Structures are given as structure tokens and as C-alpha cells.
Design a protein around this ligand. Structure first.
Ligand SMILES: Nc1nc2c(ncn2[C@@H]2O[C@H](COP(=O)(O)OP(=O)(O)OP(=O)(O)O)[C@@H](O)[C@H]2O)c(=O)[nH]1
Ligand SMILES: Nc1nc2c(ncn2[C@@H]2O[C@H](COP(=O)(O)OP(=O)(O)OP(=O)(O)O)[C@@H](O)[C@H]2O)c(=O)[nH]1
Ligand SMILES: [Mg+2]
Ligand SMILES: [Mg+2]
Lengths: 174, 35, 37, 177
């Protein structure tokens, strides 16, 4: 049923769109009604890379601090982590540095990482320039893109790229 | 062609509840391993 | 003033949820072995 | 939380005796004859009412094959009731109930509620285990007994409601002190 199996997480502040980004990836849909994640949610999608079947087990964490202990235990064993902020919400962007510390303190040293500046369709309420997002990511040597679950921008590209990077690192070891 | 709309909806409701419990169980088991 | 989802859509939802359930059950089973339940 | 009580139940017993079919009948009020052996474990929820209170049953349907013994036995701890299922047309499955009871006693709590189900009682012609023998085994162990049929829908509701009642009564008596 699959050639590789990759564990992915999405982390970042409550409300930035982690569930919507995954919902767009998982089922090509968007719903604007906010239902904050209770602790954790889970989805499966199998993609193909280099003619091989890649099964993605994707864990969608709650962003609220009340769930930190529950969500943090999923970091061990993760092979790729999406760090998500909301381009209309400067504080969610500022918090990315704290989220990276949480990764570095709990996940594998070589876990693959990617930063997503989500809600890039709401340019009329933007608080974080694309340039500052690219710079933060450059400061940490992490890949970066702006996404929109609602308009379906860079969501496919985010996961396929993360998955490609995980696979290349795996393949290099053989 | 014997499944019907309401039976299918009920199936979805049932699996969604099973999923919710299972996710709770994974979360708690993981915390018990983490000590 | 909003649409009933189709049963084709319902059929797909069940399949997706069953595959999720199968993985979670496997995960529960392996975690319990690690704890020595 | 919709519910007032929460009971973890297990079904155990030899492969092919009908544990999954018994649960499917209780869960969804249907029966399918095509055998699909359970891979490790399956899981079903059903909420019933006793004494005007809402009783959520978390029900774990274990694989019977010995290849899955390690996986399935880790579910025993914390179970509050266990169905021990054999197949009235299959004497070996009945003979093995005593081994399943030993597996319960070695891994579950001392006061777990237990019940023996003699399943496929609709297949009268191919019966290998008389009802009297099933009743005597149960009597030897002080455990409740019923003959059931997932297919003809005999005693499936009765079995789960009785086990739940016995669990609930044990808890209530404990609470009142
Ligand atoms: N315009 C626009 N709104 C979005 C987008 N993504 C999410 N939203 C909105 O932002 C709200 C929050 O989205 P969620 O995915 O639930 O946020 P979350 O990160 O999963 O929040 P928690 O589960 O609490 O951690 C949603 O109700 C949507 O309305 C997007 O790409 N564009
Ligand atoms: N006539 C009749 N057949 C039954 C009954 N219950 C189960 N069967 C059949 O017996 C076979 C085994 O049923 P299952 O429920 O899959 O058995 P199991 O105990 O769950 O087997 P494992 O998962 O391998 O442990 C299936 O072909 C069912 O159709 C019953 O009450 N009456
Ligand atoms: Mg969410
Ligand atoms: Mg079975």
C-alpha cells in the first residue's frame, strides 16, 4: 500500500489556519467556521514521488497553550513539521521563534521543517510582509512559503516539498 | 446499492466518535510513556 | 438554504474515516505494548 | 461528556467463533456471513441507558488467533467486563474457554465482570456442545452464561445489557459504601 511512510505535524498559534490548511490538502475544501482543535486531529494522504507511494500520516495539533503537554508528545518521531502563522496576525508570526525552540527541544535534530505564512488571500488585513516572513525563515535556514487554505495557494506545494525533502534525506542514507 | 443516505450519515457520525475517543487514547498513552 | 451532501460524498467520508481508524487502532496497540499494559 | 457511566468491554475467544459478528449485531443491528478475521483489534462505541442513566460502552473486539495474543492481551487491563465467546458447533472453542479464563485472571482486575456466550445457537443441526455442558462450565466458574446468535439476533442485546447492569450494580454498591 505504500513505499514510504512519513509522520508530519502542523504546529503554531491557535487560529492561524493549521486545520484549514490540512483540510484543503486532505479533502480539497474550505469552510470558514472556526472549530478550534481539541488537542489533536489526524489525516492520511498518499502521494507519489519518483514513482513511489508516500503515505503521509499528518497530525494537526491544537495551538492553544492549554494543550501544550498533549501536543508536544507528538513531536518525537515526526519527520517533517509545518510551522504555521497568520499573515494578518503579527503576534502569531513573532511566536514562530518560540515554536522553533519547541521543535528543537523535543523533535529529532534532523527533522525537516517548513514555515507557512497562511491566509495570504487576506492582503487587506496583512500585518507581516512576505519579505519579513522570508527573512525569518532565512535566519533559521528553513524553507518558507505563503499559503491560503481558502484560495488554495501553495498548499499542495507545501506538503509535496516537505515530503520531497524528507525522502531525499532518507535516500541519501542508502 | 443498498446503503442509504441516513444509514451512511449515521455511519459517519459513529466513525467520527470512534475517532475522537481513539485520538484521546493515543494522547494519554503517549503522556504515560513520556515519564 | 444549504445543500445536503451527496451520498457519493458520504461514501468517500466513510472510506476515509475507516482508513484513519485502522491506523489509529494499530497505533494504540503498539503504544500499549511499549507501556507493558 | 454526554454519558454518566463509561464501561470498557472486551470480547475474547477463539478465532471464528463470532465475536465480531456478535458486536456487529449489537452495534449496527445487522449480520454478514463472509468471514473477515480481525487484524489485531477492532473498536465500537454504543451508549445505552440503565436506571435512567446514560452508559457509554467502549467495546474492544479482539482477534482470537494466537499470533495476536500479545497485542490483544494488553487491552485486558482496565476492562470492566469481558465476553468469553465460543462456538456451539465447535467443541475445541468450548474446550479453550478455560484457557481464556486463565488469560483473564492473569491480566485483568480481580473483580472484572465476566460472561460466557455460546454463539451460533441458530445452527442447531451442527451443534457439538450441548447447552447443558455450557451451563455447567459456567456454573463451575460462577460466571453468567447465555447461548447467542448474531445471525438470528438471539440474546445479543440481552448479553450486553446484563453485563452492563452487573458492572453498574457493582459500582453503585461501592459508591454508597
Ligand atoms: N481568508 C482566510 N481565512 C482562513 C484561512 N485559513 C483559515 N482561515 C480562517 O481562520 C479560522 C481558523 O482556522 P483553523 O484552521 O481552525 O485554525 P487552527 O490553526 O487549526 O486553530 P487551532 O485548532 O485552535 O490551533 C478559520 O475559521 C477560518 O475562518 C485562509 O487561508 N484564508
Ligand atoms: N449461523 C451463524 N454464523 C455466525 C454467527 N456468528 C458468526 N457467524 C459466522 O461465523 C464466521 C466468524 O465470525 P466472526 O465474528 O468473524 O468470528 P471472530 O470470532 O470475530 O474471528 P476472529 O476475528 O478471527 O477472532 C463468520 O463467517 C460469521 O459469518 C451466528 O450467530 N450464526
Ligand atoms: Mg485546528
Ligand atoms: Mg473478529
Amino acid at each position: 500500500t505504500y513505499d514510504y511512510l512519513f509522520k508530519l505535524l502542523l504546529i503554531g498559534d491557535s487560529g492561524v489556519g493549521k486545520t484549514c490548511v490540512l483540510f484543503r490538502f486532505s479533502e480539497d475544501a474550505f469552510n470558514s467556521t472556526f472549530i478550534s482543535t481539541i488537542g489533536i486531529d489526524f489525516k492520511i494522504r498518499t502521494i507519489e514521488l519518483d514513482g513511489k507511494r508516500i503515505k503521509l500520516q499528518i497530525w494537526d495539533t491544537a495551538g492553544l497553550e492549554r494543550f501544550r503537554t498533549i501536543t508536544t508528545a507528538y513531536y518525537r518521531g515526526a519527520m517533517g513539521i509545518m510551522l504555521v502563522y497568520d499573515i494578518t496576525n503579527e503576534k502569531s508570526f513573532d511566536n514562530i521563534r518560540n515554536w522553533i525552540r519547541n521543535i528543537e527541544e523535543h523533535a529529532s535534530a534532523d527533522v525537516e521543517k517548513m514555515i507557512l505564512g497562511n491566509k495570504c488571500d487576506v492582503n487587506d488585513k496583512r500585518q507581516v510582509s512576505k519579505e519579513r516572513g522570508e527573512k525569518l525563515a532565512l535566519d533559521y535556514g528553513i524553507k518558507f512559503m505563503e499559503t491560503s487554505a481558502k484560495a488554495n495557494i501553495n498548499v499542495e506545494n507545501a506538503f509535496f516539498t516537505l515530503a520531497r525533502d524528507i525522502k531525499a534525506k532518507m535516500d541519501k542514507k542508502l | 446499492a443498498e446503503q442509504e443516505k441516513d444509514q451512511l450519515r449515521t455511519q459517519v457520525v459513529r466513525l467520527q466518535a470512534e475517532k475522537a475517543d481513539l485520538l484521546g487514547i493515543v494522547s494519554e498513552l503517549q503522556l504515560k510513556l513520556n515519564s
